[model samples]
Target chain A: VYNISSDFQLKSLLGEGAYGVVCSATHKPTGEIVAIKKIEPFDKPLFALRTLREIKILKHFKHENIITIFNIQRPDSFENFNEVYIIQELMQTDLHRVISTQMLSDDHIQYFIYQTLRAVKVLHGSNVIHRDLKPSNLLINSNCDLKVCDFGLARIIDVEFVATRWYRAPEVMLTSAKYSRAMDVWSCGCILAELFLRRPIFPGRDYRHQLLLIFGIIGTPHSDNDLRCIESPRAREYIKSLPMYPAAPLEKMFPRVNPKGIDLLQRMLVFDPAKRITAKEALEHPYLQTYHDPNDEPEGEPIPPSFFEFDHYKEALTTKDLKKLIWNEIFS
Target chain B: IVYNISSDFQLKSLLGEGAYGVVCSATHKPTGEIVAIKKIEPFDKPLFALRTLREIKILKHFKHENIITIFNIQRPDSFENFNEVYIIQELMQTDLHRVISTQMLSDDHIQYFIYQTLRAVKVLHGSNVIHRDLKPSNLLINSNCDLKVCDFGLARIIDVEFVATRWYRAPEVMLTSAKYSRAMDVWSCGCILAELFLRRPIFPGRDYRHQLLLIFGIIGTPHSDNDLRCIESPRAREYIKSLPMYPAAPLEKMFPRVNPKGIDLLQRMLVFDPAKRITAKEALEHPYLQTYHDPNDEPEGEPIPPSFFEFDHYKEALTTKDLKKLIWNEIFS
Candidate 1:
């Protein structure tokens, strides 16, 4: 029934997403198990472009904390190609699956958070931002090793998107607010909180409800006369217009977490992007002192600026032209 | 072909060929940037395949100004058919060995080159990487003289002697295959420094046994029985005891054309016992490299997790099929 895909013996379906369906499979030649993602996105434009972005970024990134792309399948004939199959390292489970089911100890939480920031430090330093960081996007194993995945929503900081609603930064909701690397940091803060409480801290029903839920915890970021964090005058007026809320005690939110942990979270989940604890600084936080080693924490060089050239011209290009570019990625 | 090579690269010229694979300079069709690609047919032998996996892992981990970096790992045709590994690295004009053999050098040239070499070694050893093979040819250099060490195939990281070149090989390396320490690299650096001045290896020996005699001729017999204590090869110690008693010659006499500081540094570097030999870190602080050496400016590498190299432990037990898949895993993931 299969020819080229015969190299990989399909084991079992793992899950599915907007991009493709994932399966745990074994390579007959290598005998190493891997995750194969099957994406037949020729019928769609956005999904096809997401597939293209992930391939280029994963191929370029080489870090222990970053998910690795092993291979992308090529068809016998490009003329009849209908699908793009990608093979990746088969991780056991994701952070969402782990935190939801299993209770995490302090050591597990610290290690997971440390690794997440480690990956983020490298990504941000390389001038790329994982705009869609979520618990589900982080793959993990029994040993507590965590690797950041899902680069489909990642973009260069200079050149970025909307992460999930619950994990989204406060600034992303405002119209005039220009997104920076801090968006990822805020999402990480939400995940840290989620890991402790075992629930999404801000699960909103809609866009309007999301900010309301966030404001309930961190309190309304405002001043006596005007809004402090909101940049756009209209957005500031709108924030001033919302029911006033005060900064809630973090200990109430994380009753069992360590004081230093709350301290780190408070610094990370600040209203102002500039005041937020940076990815590099978070790794150095006293809360993670057990795992912090300046010498061991490596920094990454920025990828070439030309990497986002396709993104610059994508809006003007047709679907067929986009397909041709995907072909070029595989053939090259 | 069901899988094919990317049409993006236009072959520029053949660089050279080695036992594992052939290397060529190629141009990326779009950006027009030149890169050196090593198309290794690693599956031909399990050992070479293992080497291919290790080098790829090591290179990616040790990205530094003094270390060569990988530009790309060419995508394979398919998981089932994948065999070759196409590693694309930043291209350089030539290596240190060629540069040394081609012309004479000024003291400034010698200082900067040796300093850069030590900078690389400091990072590697700090990260617990022992580059067993640190010779002139392994150190790649640009026409503008940006030196980067390459050929990490023979190195041991995260923690081996399949004997390397005899000239660059330290005495301790020849005596104890796996017991040698990071000092072995210092020995290689010493020989390279001499080669820089003399345009030939300081200890050029014809065979394994001859290698020691040539080293002994310059380094002299041990100062006392204590100096010979490190020789684990029982026969080697007995043989050294049986040799004619030769006094250590002054490095000044050997390197008369070199500066006093350079000769003084060589004296510490070219010691008979590895324990007394100067370390790469200590050598960088020597007066000979003073002009170019700056401790703060030098970068260090992160220690590769010992767990990452767990496969090397059961290397002997792995079969050819096992190695092929293992190498394939390295290529794909």
Candidate 2:
């Protein structure tokens, strides 16, 4: 219903990425300020397919800490319809910038982590996995309210390699095992560590170096039971041969951190997927107790049987139907 | 790519044919809703891209009841290099051409029908678009007597080729190099209204030269001082002057079944000078159409302005990459 240039006045270039350019705009009708992400001209069907999936998932997710998609606009002509502009709620800063320049108290770190976990809980409850979770993907307002953004790489199961190297789950790196929501928990642990350290805890150059950094702090799990838990024999043998070191205290890693906060971080950063604390359990940790409200508890919906099936998405999206659906959703 | 339009719709029978392909009537398997499917040849050429975009853009822009609705669009499974396109539209009982041939309409019916046609025309012109090929065949009608305009292939702002049907060809388009305007559409509207009364074309021209002959025989020769200025072509003016002058025919004699008010409006629409022809807005206000006229009944939405047809801005020519991107944005949108 709106012509992009007519309805929104582009103010400044915010940034650009694999998807497209992000810009600040002023909505002419409402005089409301907003950020618009222009998805790269879908040069191929696969690109469009991924964008469509993200739009659907974003529309379904409703949480205070999840980025909101206000509208999607395309050029009037279908023959040259290339770019899609995603109107998102504007946030002053992202977690990466905040971690870089801002001094944070333990309360600031805990509250941000709490909000991130709450967003993840909502996503996990809906059986969706945000495969690519990094500090840059997380946005924060002037008030320090955090929201998880960028669902372009999200899915119900692992496809191609995903997520930043530093935040990747150990299982995702070592084995061909199907990834679960535990992968996201591992990312949360890395983010928590980063907030305190003001740097990535395991800033690995690659997969091999990534494992080395994790083992350097957490130490190689050489126990007979721990080796038995590893699914890949090569990975298990590789770990067995490496010089084993005693587990370094996470308390030492985050100096002056509360013992309870370290306990929660240790539970989330476990090498074994089963040992990793779920978002529901993480919300209950004593470290987050002060921020939690009994009335605002996470809804832990179990994964449905048809959760990972995306065969229905195989149908090609037409501009006609897509526009009608998006407009109805936006106006409704 | 997984969807095959044929598998979901049962093609019953072929409805009509065109230069590119045929249209068929089909029933949707799931909803059982009847739809008319127009199967067109794969438009791979750059020239066709602008025309194709015009149809789609205009179709999506208009949401009026008197405008044809596009339900869905289907393309071949080989999306990267497809050979065909299927445009699914709401199935109507028949077109206006067939309706007029079979049904005996009252004056009230004609008033309502023309009123609806004007509303559709108003919506297009409001956007500064001229439905260059507004013929009886393009106006679809159902059993309920509802009319909706279709086929925007020839709808343009200017520089259209002389491709309209010989019967409904406007005076400016035939004899002059003048850019066809909204007034040209009014002339065709006059032809359609005359056809409704006579049950055949009013000025059924045999050819380019004969068309003017037939027109002059009925409406008489134009005034050289005023009307001649409207004709831009010197060669056409010289040719018209060579022929013997013909007396104007009585409107009553031509359309015996039409009322005096209806004949007067028809005469005004069939003016020899394009500038003098009654416009769509003026035609709607005429006494003949006043019964069905309701200001509130007008169609809504901003018009697809003339500048919207600037094909150069659509990335020069439709390269393979541009075409692919358009297809993805079109089908998977």
Candidate 3:
């Protein structure tokens, strides 16, 4: 009986992040469905930055492809004061959930990448750079439409921030040099590789191992001396001594993937940033071009009614249960 | 009972324009000491430009000498309707306005100008406060030429808000065309610096729009046409397109007599964008003014507590007659 909490019946818990939990809640007043992300920390710098970034980004952005921010209200009284609730579009599931649930066919993977590109294009148009472009950050609403969320890592071009571990670009990992919007394009490539492989292509458990894994897959670094300037002195030595494989042969790695899909994925995972395909150019690639539908997508499931609960979602509504599920499926 | 505002007060008659508000002399309550009273009008565009909210919030956060001090006097039931609030500080009989009006400024005037401006701005930056309006008018001097900032109207988010008064707006205001911060304030100081020599608005444009045009006329236009919203409005297109033909006369155009250091200071303040404009601390490092400021020039007059203005607020309760006058002013001629 949380009085100030939206009377919208708790439909189900989506998932929990390092900072907060996302739940799909139906608004009682408008009878509208929205995802409520309940975050407890209001003072931590990272959380504050995320809050500011989300607010600043949403303040200007208003579009269909982008996830609309319905509300960001703090309960007035101190009784529930520390909690910050962000009401957003009730995205059905994320690309990660979709990928993990079923082995995505080549067509499904291409479609997901195309949708991700479309959302990224919208973000770039607003000069917003989503530093973390991964399957987990991409939310699929009821219509299979993709919307980019989690501005915790997205920052405006004029403002600056270091990239998150998994999706960090080569330029950002380098010492002290100022990075740009191009860093996001690099992350987009890594995600495409992950989708095709059905596993993280550059999966490292932690920061150092992550770089090592990237080096391992991409074939060791060419300049060991220059690489030493970046964190791993050993990586530079291992990479320089190792053979460099052209990214063009990723098709062999996944024979099931179409040559066009493999080609697009390889172009993204190119080692030399000078040759990395940009988000715009990637959108124009054959895989995306083949999947792009010019017609207006039909209306989605009448925007899920208030008190609407998805069978899988509302059934697992508590943080403890979500953590339990995560441990069982993901960690284990 | 926030009444008899000038009671037990000393000092002199109401002097003319002293920045954000009108000025007068008054005596303190317990100390029975003399001080200057400066008044500001509420609902004025200046308040919105300065982000009066951030100023109040910051002042409550860090009470510093650079900030206008507030006295915690109970608000009377009467003056609630009127937004006119008064600030009582150590009365400084002479301000930059007086020097400019008299058309005679000495090296001492220049030193006080740079020193006080830097001190106030430094305090703001130290407390993460931006004195968005740092024009000569906002910079006040005492009979001893001490400086104190009065207006906290346009101070907030260093990232945005085009809050500076029209004549002194920064290049970003002309570029981003939004409320901005300390960079814009330094630009205002540039205008104030030039004013010390010219004795009037150095680059006064007819309106806020013209002021922006004047900025483009001097600084180069933005690199991309995309940066300028040409198609959105005819007025914007006409202005940005016309920017190609502006006067880029070095600061020598405005202040022929001033040293190169002063000119360099002026040039940096008027940079094309708020990001490029020199910071207050950076401006303090300028060769021309740095050597001149005496660390020994302590604030003249007695040390007055902040907010001597809060208690003296003229809370003219709107009566039926006052209400009728307001309604008439609101409705008919």
Off by over 4 Å in 3: A1-7, A13-21, A74-81, A158-164, A175-178, A205-208, A219-248, A293-332, B1-333
Residues B1-333 of candidate 1: C-alpha lDDT, one tens digit per residue:
111357898888888877567888989899999998888766534456667877887787777888899887887766566767788999889999999988898988988898899999999888888877789998899988889987776677645123334787777666554333788888888899889888898887755567778888888876476887677667667777666667877878766778888878777888868888898888898988888888887876667666666664431134345566666666566
Error of 1 at A250 (Å): 68
- The full ranking of all candidates by lDDT, starting with the best, is 1, 2, 3
For all candidates, what are the clash counts? 2, 7, 26
TM-score of predicted chain B, candidate 2: 0.87
Q: Where does candidate 2 chain A have its weakest 10-residue lDDT segment? A: A311-320
Candidate 1: which pairs clash? A30-B325, A70-B332
Query: Per-residue lDDT for A1-332 in model 1, tens only?
Result: 12346777988988875455888888999899988888876654545667878888788888888999898888768678877888889899899989899888988899999999999999898998887788998999667789988787677756122334678776776653434789899999999989888889888765557778888888887873335556577778777778778889999868888888999989988777878899999999899999999977768888765786775532223345557768888888
Query: How accurate locally is residue B281 in candidate 1, as Cα lDDT from 0 to 100?
Result: 84
Candidate 3 local lDDT, residue B102: 80
For each candidate in the order shown, give its overall lDDT on alpha carbons: 0.77, 0.73, 0.57
Alpha-carbon TM-score of each model against the true structure: 0.49, 0.47, 0.41
Query: By summed lDDT, which 10 consecutive residues of candidate 1 chain A come out lowest?
Result: A312-321
lDDT of 2 by residue, A1-332 (tens): 22376778888888775456788899999999999887653432334445665677776666788888787774565445556778988889989999999878889888998999988988888777886688988899978889998775576642232334678777776765534888899999999888878889998755566778898887788886776557777778878776677678888777678788889889988888888898878888899998877558557455553433443232223333343333334344
Model 1 score (lDDT)? 0.77
lDDT of 2 by residue, B1-333 (tens): 122466778888888775445788988898999888877653533334445656776776678888899887775566556756678988888888998899888988888887788888888887677887787888889888899998786677643132434677676676665545888778788888888888888787645567778888888887576767787667778878876688788988755757888899889988888888887777788899888877676754465545666642322112334444454456655
